[PDB]
C-alpha cells in the first residue's frame, strides 16, 4: 500500500537523506550546512539522495547566510544556487557565474547572487551575464533556467512577481535570514522568500521543458577570487519520493516488520538490485517463505531487481519464525 513516502528532512535526519560534497560541512547540533567558508576558491554542495515528485508539493523552510560582502560592498561572491535537475541524482552545478545551477541541463531553480557578472562569462562558465536590471550594486535574487547544454540564464520579466530583483536586505554582516521555497504540486507554483522578499512563478513550462516530472535537488555555493561564508540552516525539507522502491520484511504470521522497511532510491529507468536480506533474517531465526510484488510491476524475482519508475514501488518479503 505504501509506495512513495512523504519525507521531512530535519537537522537530525539530514545525513540519512542528503549528502554533502566538496568544501561543505555540516553541524548536526545546529542544522547548519556550511557550503563555503569565507576564503578563496571554495565549492561546496549538499544534494538530496532521492528524486522529488513535482506532481506533489514540496517545501524548504530554513535560513540562509549569504555572507558579508557583495557587489559594490567588498569583494563578495559567488552566491548560493538551489537547483532542480531532470539529470541524475548527486550531480551539482558549477562554481562562479553558474552559481551552482549552470552546468546542469534543462534545470531550473533560484539563486542568491552576490557578485554581478556584468560582462559575458566565458564558454566554460556555463552562464550568460547577469542582467542589467540588477547591476550597479547590491546582491540580487532570481529564478534561473539552463538550456540543453547546461548554460544558465538569469530569469527576467516585466512582472514584479518573478523578475530578478536586488535583495531588500543586503548581506552586510553574516546574518542568517529566513529562506523558504514552497512548491504546490497541483498548481505547479513555486514561491521563494528571502528575508521578507518574495518571488513567485508557475513553473509548469520549465517542468515540461525538462522532459520529466521528478527532480534531483542540490544546494551549491562557491567562491572565486571573491568570497563569503555561505550557509544554509535546516530547518526542514518536505517532499514526496519519486523513483523509489520500498522493501518490507514481514513476519508471515503476525504481519509485522521484522526489520525496518528499506527504501531504495534511483534515477528513472535505473535497474536496481534489491536485497531480501535472507542471511540476516536467518540470524534472527527467520526462514524465507514468499514474496508479494503486486505493488512493484517491474519486479524481477529471478534477478531480484526493480526498474525505478516516476512513481514508487513496494516489494514485501515474507518470513516465518
Ligand atoms: Ca553572478
Residue numbers in the entry: 253 to 573
Verbatim from the authors:
S. aureus encodes a 2,271-residue SRRP termed serine-rich adhesin for binding to platelets (SraP), that is involved in the pathogenesis of infective endocarditis. S. aureus SraP, a surface-exposed serine-rich repeat glycoprotein (SRRP), is required for the pathogenesis of human infective endocarditis via its ligand-binding region (BR) adhering to human platelets. We determine the 2.05 Å crystal structure of SraPBR, revealing a rod-like tandem organization of four discrete modules: a legume lectin-like module, a module with a β-grasp fold, and two tandem cadherin-like modules that create the rigid stem of SraPBR. Further structural and biochemical analyses reveal that the legume lectin-like module specifically binds to N-acetylneuraminic acid (Neu5Ac), which may mediate adhesion to host sialylated receptors.
